[PDB]
Design a protein around this ligand. Structure first.
Ligand SMILES: Nc1ncnc2c1ncn2[C@@H]1O[C@H](COP(=O)(O)OP(=O)(O)O)[C@@H](O)[C@H]1O
Ligand SMILES: Nc1nc2c(ncn2[C@H]2C[C@H](O)[C@@H](COP(=O)(O)O)O2)c(=O)[nH]1
Ligand code: BEF
Ligand SMILES: [Mg+2]
Lengths: 48, 50, 112, 98, 417, 417
DNA sequence: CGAGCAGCTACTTGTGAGCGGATA
DNA sequence: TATCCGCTCACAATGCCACACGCGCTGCTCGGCC
RNA sequence: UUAAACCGGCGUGUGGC
């Protein structure tokens, strides 16, 4: 839940964040790329 | 709405300014100010105290 | 036979990684063993309409799979240039490339 | 705080807590040491399923050249999934009472 | 099926059709919401729906197929257009697209257009290989668009007077400068009716910006053609949206070598909206208008032009004066020099119940010799020579009396003899 | 190859040439975008392209080679000029430069000029060792530029009248004071045609600021020479850009000892743009014009001068009156005292269909004795003596009748006998 | 157009268990 | 083909308290469903 | 629908017991 991993308002581009958020970001990005790669008939080694 | 913008412009430069956003002394510490330091960014207008 | 071996690299500068790989080929005149880069990041939106024209001319995973008949000296060449994060493929480090059907697939991706 | 979401992954994934717990829970369940499962899950090796009329054993692992040379002997009846899908298939077709 | 095919008819037929589809109570939701639910059920029947609409491109790259009857605005039946179509054909704003659409799966937004079947009433092959609008060669009005009806009505004069004051043709840029309570509404009404009846070949596109909804309903179901409008019910955002959308539709239709008449009223409210939606440059002009507030209005105004290759775009935008303040007049000024066709209406004569009160003196057309034949031009020159030395009231009463005493314009020439 | 060599021809030949080059669908993008893609492919063939254009200097120090057919504006084929050329030769604004160019590598912007091969139709050695424009010695009009055509057309009179009202010569500073709907367009048209036909030695540079695009198309392909214009499609920024760019091109061409005629219409819209693009000084003048809003217009106006060493710059900028407000008239005032050549046109006579209606009374030229021979000057003095005591209508009808009854101007002198 | 990715160490020591392994 | 011997990795390392600071710049590429 | 009342996550360094 977001309340357990908050994003409090640190001014400017600098932001006071939790650690897990970057991992979730990377995981969702990789999952979206994998979902879009299978549809494009990507090379087998690339999807591997 | 255009009326709101023209109104806040003709009445100076005023908006939902009610934000306190002011620094006070921390609860528990007294003191007497003896020196003020202010530094402006290049381009920003310098107040009279600076 | 100049096979199409897939390699991952330090992303971000992937196009400049491809150009540096090409410079390293032409340095040791490695065009005998090697071919070209095939970076078909060529989703070619040009909606240059009102209020916005910055269209994404590039869309493809950060792989720059290069045509070459592989040699261990060639492997250490393609690893000698910087930004070669992963020379992927099922192996210790001497892999087998993608088949020819995916070569037709990447031709489709280039044409689109 | 109590309400949560989920992520639908297109590909299955193995839980690391049952992989490298020393001793592992999946390795002991499959009667296979950890090194082979590690090589299988990271696509440097394969693992076969539904052997049948073939000469190869089911629980064995294969490498890329082993999957290359063993593809021509049996094409249709031979099944060799790779990744977490192969592990899931092994777990699904694994009996317990027998 | 087609959304407009369900839109030409009132909410009653939509309600009974939804009852045929077996859904929740339809009359409760809005009629366009009714159409959304009805198309959802029709897609649930296992068939590919056929939709159509003009394209609106956002920053993300995808598109929306805004419908004609929805006043080219945001609606639940706006067909989503995947970016892949913009990659293949690169359909620009205003391109009337018709094709196959699918229902929105859950967590989606609207219907998605699968494959285009009709691009601007033409094959899709002409869409990619085509010469653009701002790429054309603008010219003057070569072909004349007559205005008189031909059966001699009382407001038929309101068309004849134009043909007697200053001709109107294809590709022209017309302004209507008039104060409030002068007679612009009925004027543009009979102008549209005469263009439609006498010249049914051209595409009549009447436009209405920030008027009464009763006026919109009177305009939509009185004249021939599509009637898109945006009253005061919509802010400056939707105003500029519908304006740019109809102007891009006209651009595409001229690119397809077709003539588009754009009767807009008024241009001053459009300029006010534009000045409302421009970023502040830290300075104001005389009257209270931003510096760059005129660039996009000037673009929208100069979009009209006559083309060498095919098609024309003729806009008649009404200018409003006697508003008390300066900024509107400023707009008028910034608009007298860009348009090559002026037409001025009188309120000082309209208060006398003297209609139609067109300013015969300050009306005129640039390159008007291409708008009328030789001897008719000689006779119009002599007629303006006769009209000049007499007073304003004199000229206007002479106009109204002797033209109501006539039936058609060439009959008027043959009676002045 | 040269961009203008691909620009003189329409988009159709560009499309088939791109099809020869084997690229994506060209008709979809703009024709100048077509030229950009075509030059990119031509450079891909392994050859150095030869480009040309006039230089525009930004604050960073590099330059842009704006092309003639692109109206001296920003385009995808604007050749980038590295600062090293400005360090070696110091090519100023308006210098027509031709040389070798390379394609833009990715992440770059446009083509880069490697080595200059032609500087203002001369060797590059004359570019560094040369006397500057504001460094010249201004003088009066010594050589007379005749205007009559010589075969006796109806609008040929429109040139003769000038030669009969006030002569025009090299290095002069001419104003055309006229209200709207007076006959300035056709006047400057036949003026340019007569200058080109009778005096093909001088460089005809017709200018157009904020007019109809149809007018721009009529001007470009009717007269001899380069026709750069900026209609209302461009804001005050691009207006002042094209203005300063053509004026600097004229400055450089006079520095190279060549004569440049600059027919501009109108100067009032240019002054409006200038007043739009000046910083506010916390005060306004009479009419609504900033204080320093006239400095740069005055510079642009006084750039014209006659030189002792070589070349001339003669500008004929049209002034606009009868606009209702003051500020424009203010401009006119601030411009009567700086120009040494006035020419006034009549609208009160133009409404009578009496063309051409030039104000013979308030027209004149300072130091006009250097603009015409001795006895012709005596005869013009006597002719103005004859024209003076009669009324305005009298003088004007006498002019038009007795000059249409003649064919040429010396024939007119020999007929008045 | 906005957001995310990315490019510009070597002395810890013990305790313990699991996994080759080698050696008959 | 069973039994020790050694290789390799995980897991751990008092608790509190107080104070203070720093958690970046710019270019590319991909995500597109208000 | 209306009225009243209320509305420090991490690392680092230092020091002390
Ligand atoms: N020399 C001329 N001969 C015939 N007609 C003319 C002449 N000069 C102007 N006109 C008339 O003037 C009209 C064009 O006016 P225009 O040049 O636009 O005026 P301005 O440019 O001063 O506003 C044309 O319709 C034309 O009939
Ligand atoms: N007209 C209209 N605009 C909407 C509606 N909902 C959202 N928008 C606009 C406001 C947002 O700034 C914009 C999308 O912003 P962004 O691309 O997420 O869509 C709606 O219901 N109608
Ligand atoms: F009406 Be003109 F062009 F000044
Ligand atoms: Mg004119």
């Amino acid at each position: 839940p977001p309340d357990l991993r908050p994003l409090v308002p640190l001014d400017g581009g600098r932001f006071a964040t939790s650690d897990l958020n970057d991992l979730y970001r990377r995981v969702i990005n990789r999952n979206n790329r994998l979902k879009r790669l299978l549809d494009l008939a990507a090379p087998d080694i690339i999807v591997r | 709405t255009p009326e709101e913008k023209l109104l806040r412009a003709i009445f100076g430069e005023k908006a939902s300014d009610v934000k306190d956003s002011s620094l006070r002394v921390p609860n528990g510490v007294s003191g007497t100010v003896i020196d003020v330091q202010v530094f402006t960014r290049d381009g920003v207008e310098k107040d009279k105290r600076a | 036979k100049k096979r199409w071996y897939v390699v991952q690299a330090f992303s971000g500068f992937e196009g400049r990684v491809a150009t540096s790989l090409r410079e390293h080929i032409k340095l040791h005149n490695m065009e005998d063993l090697f071919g070209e880069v095939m970076v078909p990041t060529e989703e070619v939106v040009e909606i240059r309409g009102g209020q916005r024209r910055k269209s994404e001319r590039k869309f493809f995973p950060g792989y720059v799979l290069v045509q070459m008949v592989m040699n261990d000296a060639s492997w250490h060449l393609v690893r000698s240039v910087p930004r070669v994060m992963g020379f992927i493929g099922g192996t210790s480090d001497r892999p087998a490339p993608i088949s020819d059907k995916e070569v037709d697939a990447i031709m489709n991706r280039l044409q689109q | 705080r109590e309400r949560m979401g989920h992520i639908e992954l297109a590909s299955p994934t193995a839980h690391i807590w049952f992989l490298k717990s020393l001793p592992s829970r999946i390795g002991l369940l499959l009667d296979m040491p950890l090194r082979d499962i590690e090589r299988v899950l990271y696509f440097e090796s394969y693992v076969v399923i539904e052997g049948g009329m073939t000469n190869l054993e089911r629980q064995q692992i294969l490498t890329e050249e082993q999957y290359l040379d063993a593809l021509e002997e049996f094409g249709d009846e031979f099944d060799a999934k790779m990744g977490a899908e192969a592990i899931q298939a092994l777990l699904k077709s694994m009996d317990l009472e027998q | 099926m087609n959304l407009t095919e369900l839109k030409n008819t009132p909410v009653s037929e939509l309600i009974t059709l939804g009852e045929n589809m077996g859904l929740e109570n339809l009359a409760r939701m809005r009629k366009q919401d009714i159409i959304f639910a009805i198309l959802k059920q029709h897609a649930k029947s296992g068939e590919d729906i056929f939709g159509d609409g003009v394209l609106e491109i956002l920053q993300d790259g995808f598109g929306f197929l805004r419908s004609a009857d929805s006043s080219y605005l945001a609606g639940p039946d706006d067909i989503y257009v995947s970016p892949s179509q913009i990659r293949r054909f690169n359909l620009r704003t205003g391109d009337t697209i018709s094709g196959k659409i699918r229902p929105p799966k859950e967590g989606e937004r609207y219907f998605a257009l699968l494959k285009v079947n009709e691009v601007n009433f033409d094959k899709p092959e002409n869409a990619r290989n085509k010469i653009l609008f701002e790429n054309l060669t603008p010219l003057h009005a070569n072909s004349r668009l007559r205005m008189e009806r031909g059966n001699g009505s009382t407001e038929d004069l309101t068309a004849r007077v134009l043909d007697l004051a200053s001709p109107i043709g294809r590709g022209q840029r017309g302004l209507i400068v008039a104060p409030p309570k002068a007679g612009k509404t009925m004027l543009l009404q009979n102008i549209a009716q005469s263009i439609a009846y006498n010249h049914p070949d051209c595409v009549l596109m009447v436009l209405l910006i920030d008027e009464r909804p009763e006026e919109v309903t009177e305009m939509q179901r009185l004249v021939k053609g599509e009637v898109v409008a945006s009253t005061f019910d919509e802010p400056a955002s939707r105003h500029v949206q519908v304006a740019e959308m109809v102007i891009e539709k006209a651009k595409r239709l001229v690119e397809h070598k077709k003539d588009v008449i754009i009767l807009l009223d008024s241009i001053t409210r459009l300029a006010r909206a534009y000045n409302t939606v421009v970023p502040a440059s830290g300075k104001v002009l005389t009257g209270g208008v931003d510096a760059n507030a005129l660039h996009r209005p000037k673009r929208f105004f100069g979009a009209a032009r006559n083309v060498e290759e095919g098609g024309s775009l003729t806009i008649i935008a009404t200018a409003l004066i006697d508003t008390g303040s300066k900024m509107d007049e400023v707009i008028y000024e910034e608009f007298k020099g860009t348009g090559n066709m002026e037409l001025h209406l009188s309120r000082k004569i309209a208060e006398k119940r003297v209609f139609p009160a067109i300013d015969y003196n300050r009306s005129g057309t640039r390159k008007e010799e291409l708008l009328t034949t030789q001897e008719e031009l000689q006779k119009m020159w002599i007629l303006r020579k006769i009209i000049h030395p007499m007073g304003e009231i004199d000229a206007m009463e002479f106009l109204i009396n002797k033209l109501a005493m006539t039936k058609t314009n060439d009959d008027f020439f043959e009676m002045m003899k």
